[PDB]
């Protein structure tokens, strides 16, 4: 099985070079390898699938890069979220698995109350907003303080054919959409909620810091948002940090807290849609 | 002396973490520090320069990032070239010192034969082209196969008030400007000339591979350029590898090869301006 070995021997060596950086070293290597050969994952099994000395060196270089902690998805240029391919790159936060659960709850709520207008603060790549626009009929108003996030969220909205229902503007909270505030029925968000003093793992070291830190508390976004806006008549669903429930209850009243599929508190839900 | 102890002790610890990654260890830390503090390098001495525990942590994180081999200029977001500050980021090649000497020779020939039209192939961040427009009267036609490079080159063009003399377009070689071909009196370029088999230093590992490699030989760009364009009545000045002179003589005849300030062969000059 001439070529069958070689590629799989290579796969294993690389996998070994990545452990200590990721528990899913084999998966990552498979992804890096198919990306460099220009084939879909599935074709990694094709008989007589070859790797030239150039493609081999490229793979070793990308593996050496990933070994430094650099994000796998920055290397891939994309991250799958809700089954959709979101373009990502340096300067943009990479969508996380827990945020998918926030979107599924948002969709269930949109179905339930026949909601038509949604907001996505801190849209980043557009993960939450674009997905909502993709699997519902709602229109979405998104914002981000990052110029780079706005341009990327636009591309991602266009990429999935929802540019007609997903609008993003640069700025903080909902300031760029003052004229639409009254009309917004649901406000979603996965804001920066990491404590200033929190230790950053090697890979998050490469993500935008403005996407992570929420002050000493890691609650600055919540305090300022709930302090400045009137949530009357609206529904607010936001992702939070495992240990912020008690402190959050003192920032916004009548709030409900739901947990992950991992059993950790992950979402705050305020329903003032009387 | 008290507040000076804080910052200067930090700078020393940081430098320690960067040895083995760079010989200009302390210079880099000085650049990184003045960036998170929002001041010029020249003000690092000042009176009482303090570092909040937040700025301290950010500095340590950026040093931890540089420690991985991540390019210093990607962290800084800029590179000084010809005394001008050029924006750079992932996806764009960081201007190199040597290329400054190519530009000086370019301004030499422009302010001699009184040249008015210049081309810059593979402009990257625009260092060569933009600098030429900024220090002379000639206009420049820049190109690059990198969409990312095109946008940055353009930004740097506006950033230096030369958007009216610097025109960049996506595509390879001079195709995107074919109709201006006869108009161009001088063709400048710092193309990819690294052998596809060459070892990549830790930080080069983070730059665009299309900006580095020129085939097994390292001379692909040259071979294709000279075998496609008639250089009659034009001056061609390009950067080359230090070990490519002899093989390059077999690709283009009647060419002169100039040396670095470091004694290495770095440029090829074909003057056919009759
Ligand atoms: C964790 S990231 C978002 C990632 C993306 N929403 C997701 O779910 O994958 C948080 C984003 O909030 C943005 N951000 C931070 N403060 C903000 C504010 N006050 N208003 C709007 N956006 C903000 C950042 O630029 C960052 O992209
Ligand atoms: C070594 S970098 C140039 C660095 C230099 N500091 C500058 O400002 O041009 C080479 C650039 O050439 C571009 N390039 C590579 N092949 C090319 C081609 N066939 N035609 C035009 N540009 C090309 C790349 O996208 C890359 O940005
Ligand atoms: N929302 C945030 O604070 C961004 C980071 C996110 N909690 C994560 O580590 O996946
Ligand atoms: N234009 C080039 O290929 C010069 C790049 C330079 N040899 C480097 O690797 O730093």
XYZ file of C-alpha atoms and ligand atoms in Angstrom, chain B residues 81 91-96 99 120-129 143-147 149 171-174 189-193 208 210-213 221 224 239, ligand 2:
68
model
C 10.440 51.843 5.933
C -1.613 38.266 5.159
C 0.961 40.908 4.241
C 4.740 40.625 3.930
C 6.703 42.827 6.327
C 9.048 45.192 4.455
C 12.710 44.212 4.907
C 14.528 46.664 0.154
C 5.906 47.965 -8.617
C 5.151 44.258 -9.024
C 4.059 42.372 -5.904
C 3.760 45.577 -3.878
C 2.734 43.831 -0.646
C 2.213 46.622 1.900
C 3.256 49.091 -0.793
C 6.661 49.933 0.714
C 8.490 50.246 -2.633
C 5.780 51.921 -4.713
C -0.004 45.078 -8.549
C -0.204 41.982 -6.381
C -1.969 38.636 -6.519
C -2.991 39.131 -2.880
C -6.337 40.807 -2.349
C -2.012 43.167 0.026
C -3.558 40.286 -10.454
C -0.119 38.938 -11.371
C 2.869 40.663 -12.943
C 1.755 43.638 -15.030
C 10.071 44.639 -7.679
C 11.016 42.566 -4.644
C 9.519 39.210 -5.666
C 9.404 35.883 -3.899
C 12.831 34.319 -4.399
C 2.123 34.796 3.310
C 2.941 33.437 -1.831
C 5.289 36.248 -0.812
C 8.200 33.881 -0.189
C 8.450 30.916 -2.568
C 9.100 34.783 -10.831
C 8.215 34.002 -16.136
C 15.770 42.329 -5.455
C 8.498 39.523 -0.824
S 6.851 40.252 -0.955
C 7.298 41.974 -1.244
C 7.835 42.719 -0.070
C 8.235 44.158 -0.349
N 8.542 44.748 0.966
C 7.131 44.944 -1.019
O 6.652 45.908 -0.408
O 6.784 44.544 -2.188
C 6.287 39.707 -2.528
C 4.872 40.089 -2.949
O 4.721 39.587 -4.285
C 3.421 39.159 -4.502
N 3.490 38.220 -5.606
C 3.873 36.897 -5.645
N 3.834 36.374 -6.847
C 3.399 37.425 -7.656
C 3.151 37.541 -9.067
N 3.335 36.508 -9.927
N 2.713 38.752 -9.577
C 2.532 39.785 -8.716
N 2.738 39.789 -7.375
C 3.174 38.565 -6.904
C 2.911 38.620 -3.151
O 1.511 38.625 -2.976
C 3.832 39.312 -2.151
O 3.090 40.361 -1.475
